Design an enzyme around this catalytic site. Structure first.
Site, PDB file in Angstrom:
ATOM      1  N   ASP A   6     -26.601  92.981  46.098  1.00  0.00           N
ATOM      2  CA  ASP A   6     -25.875  92.685  47.332  1.00  0.00           C
ATOM      3  C   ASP A   6     -25.425  94.039  47.885  1.00  0.00           C
ATOM      4  OD1 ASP A   6     -24.291  91.457  49.411  1.00  0.00           O
ATOM      5  OD2 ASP A   6     -22.729  90.844  48.011  1.00  0.00           O
ATOM      6  N   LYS A  67     -23.728  99.797  56.986  1.00  0.00           N
ATOM      7  CA  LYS A  67     -24.477  98.568  57.158  1.00  0.00           C
ATOM      8  C   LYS A  67     -24.338  98.033  58.583  1.00  0.00           C
ATOM      9  CE  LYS A  67     -24.755  93.950  55.173  1.00  0.00           C
ATOM     10  NZ  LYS A  67     -24.389  93.188  53.918  1.00  0.00           N
ATOM     11  N   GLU A 171     -28.812  86.974  52.542  1.00  0.00           N
ATOM     12  CA  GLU A 171     -27.562  86.658  51.812  1.00  0.00           C
ATOM     13  C   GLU A 171     -27.241  85.149  51.696  1.00  0.00           C
ATOM     14  OE1 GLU A 171     -24.710  89.231  53.771  1.00  0.00           O
ATOM     15  OE2 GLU A 171     -25.992  90.960  53.303  1.00  0.00           O
ATOM     16  N   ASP A 195     -19.336  82.294  54.798  1.00  0.00           N
ATOM     17  CA  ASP A 195     -19.173  83.619  54.160  1.00  0.00           C
ATOM     18  C   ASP A 195     -18.013  84.399  54.782  1.00  0.00           C
ATOM     19  OD1 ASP A 195     -19.628  86.621  53.800  1.00  0.00           O
ATOM     20  OD2 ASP A 195     -21.421  85.970  52.743  1.00  0.00           O
TER      21      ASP A 195
END
Ligand code: 3GO
Lengths: 377, 111
Positions: A6, A67, A171, A195
């Site tokens: 991850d 990211k 994800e 999430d």
């Protein structure tokens, strides 16, 4: 041996499927997640915990949140707005973003994927230090909303890190795989992946049929997390200190920090107990700050924000052309999903549906990637 | 009176006291070096370079004291734990006076 990684905006996590079990791997500091941080100093490049630990002593030269930049053009609307949250400098270079730091005597710039590959190297090394062997095969996850430039620059960060990226997996998909949702019996399932971390909120609806996955929609909030819930408690206790002591602490940086650090810790306590006590000696002008907070009061401070998580959810359902009854599975990912009120708001919107939440929400994505990496190896 | 439980707390704060003492000696080493550099042994451009090095170390020191404070702030000491409470308060107030000592240093150099 193959690992699942991850690669999160704030934290990364590595798992290995070995002896029929997923082992989520601790770093050299004993932590099962590692900060996505790279720091440039007078003498060294620091990655992970070492880099986040010196953030206060080196804000402009500590890089995180890469990211958010990865695979994007500099004039990306996202790139320009996020840049207002960062104490480090971001630069344009031929249309693509670069972070800018003094690596000692020089003054250096890195593409987001070069920073992401430093983080992946650290994850690679964490795995090698635990296994006691070379690690080169890996699944690496990405958000469902990542474009071609974003999935590819992520894959190249891996490559650079000396990894053989077997697959780039979403994800939400990876979290589904963690709960064996792809193993189910007959008809096609609609899965909602909810999430919510310290910093981002992502809602995804997938279809699974015969173990084959399809992304139906995505929604959420790029800047929503536990960071925001801590602030509601911070402002509550600043008001309280003003009330009991007729004193304004908010311009004492060291006091605000003490308070905030104590507040996020109280917050976590409140996920498993109904009250949290705080004692801070000599918080401001020598005055001690002893106080407590109930869970119900915490929930109340954050009422709008918690309730607001349901809006992305309804947008997701709209965009997937689904009714909330036609969701067969809800999966919880991110540290903030440990908050009872969030789980109850979601629990009730889906008319009592029951949530997938037994896997550590911080770890579920690396867990699903590790299952899939073994399968691919 | 005195409880077995309070020995756990007193032991925690003793270990934190020693950490404070170790940062405090780093702080001591900062003034001992500062003095030598603050006396025009080398040219101004390079003296500044030395002062900035010294400044980054003041920053480390401040950050170490701050992390000490954050650890102490996890403590919940019962009102009956009078010895723990007095040692916690002394330690906090001491660290804070070291922190004031660090602010004197860094506001004076590498500006
Ligand atoms: N070490 C470490 C570590 C590991 C994971 C995280 C990621 O957490 C992201 C967000 O999740 C929130 N969160 C987390 N995060 C997990 C976590 C675990 C241990 C920690 N130890 C020290 C500091 C933070 C920690 C967070 N747990 C929560 C809970 N039980 N109730 C409500 N919120 C919780 C955190 O406050 C963050 O805002 C953060 C730190």
């Amino acid at each position: 041996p193959a690992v699942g990684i991850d690669l999160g905006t704030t934290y990364s996590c590595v798992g290995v499927f070995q002896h029929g079990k997923v082992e989520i791997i601790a770093n050299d500091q004993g932590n099962r997640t590692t900060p996505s941080y790279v720091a440039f100093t007078d003498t060294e490049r620091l990655i992970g915990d070492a880099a986040k630990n010196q953030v206060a002593m080196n804000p402009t030269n500590t890089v995180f949140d890469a990211k958010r930049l990865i695979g994007r053009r500099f004039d990306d609307a996202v790139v320009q707005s996020d840049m207002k949250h960062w104490p480090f400098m971001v630069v344009n270079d031929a249309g693509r973003p670069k972070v800018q730091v003094e690596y000692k005597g020089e003054t250096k710039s890195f593409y987001p994927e070069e920073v992401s590959s430093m983080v992946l190297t650290k994850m690679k090394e964490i795995a090698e230090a635990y296994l006691g062997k070379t690690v080169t095969n890996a699944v690496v996850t990405v958000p469902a909303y990542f474009n071609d430039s974003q999935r590819q620059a992520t894959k190249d960060a891996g490559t650079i890190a000396g990894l053989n990226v077997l697959r780039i997996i979403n994800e939400p998909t990876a979290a589904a795989i963690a709960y064996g949702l792809d193993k189910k019996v007959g008809a096609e399932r609609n899965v909602l992946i909810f999430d919510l971390g310290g910093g981002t909120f992502d809602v995804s609806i997938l279809t699974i049929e015969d173990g084959i996955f399809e992304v139906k929609s995505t929604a959420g909030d790029t800047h929503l997390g536990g960071e925001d819930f801590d602030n509601r408690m911070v402002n509550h206790f600043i008001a309280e200190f003003k009330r009991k002591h007729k004193k304004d602490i908010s311009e004492n940086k060291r006091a605000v920090r003490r308070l905030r650090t104590a507040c996020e810790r109280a917050k976590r306590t409140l996920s498993s107990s109904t009250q949290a006590s705080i004692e801070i000696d000599s918080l401001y002008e020598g005055i001690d700050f002893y106080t407590s907070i109930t869970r119900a009061r915490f929930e109340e401070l954050n009422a709008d924000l918690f309730r607001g998580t349901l809006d992305p959810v309804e947008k997701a359902l709209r965009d997937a052309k689904l009714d909330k009854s036609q969701i067969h599975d809800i999966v919880l990912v991110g540290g903030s999903t440990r908050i009872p009120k969030i789980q109850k708001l979601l629990q009730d919107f889906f008319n009592g549906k029951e949530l997938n939440k037994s896997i550590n929400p911080d770890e579920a994505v690396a867990y699903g990637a590790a299952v899939q990496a073994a399968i691919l190896s | 009176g005195n409880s077995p439980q309070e020995e756990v707390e007193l032991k925690k704060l003793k270990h934190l006291e020693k950490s404070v003492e170790k940062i405090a000696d780093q702080l001591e080493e900062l003034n001992k070096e500062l003095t030598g550099i603050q006396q025009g042994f080398l040219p101004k451009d390079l003296q500044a370079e030395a002062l900035c090095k010294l400044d980054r170390r003041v920053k480390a020191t401040i950050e170490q004291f701050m992390k000490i404070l954050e650890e102490i702030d996890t403590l919940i000491l019962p009102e009956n734990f009078k010895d723990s409470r007095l040692k916690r308060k002394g330690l906090v107030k001491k660290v804070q006076a070291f922190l004031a000592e660090c602010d004197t240093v860094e506001q004076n150099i590498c500006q």
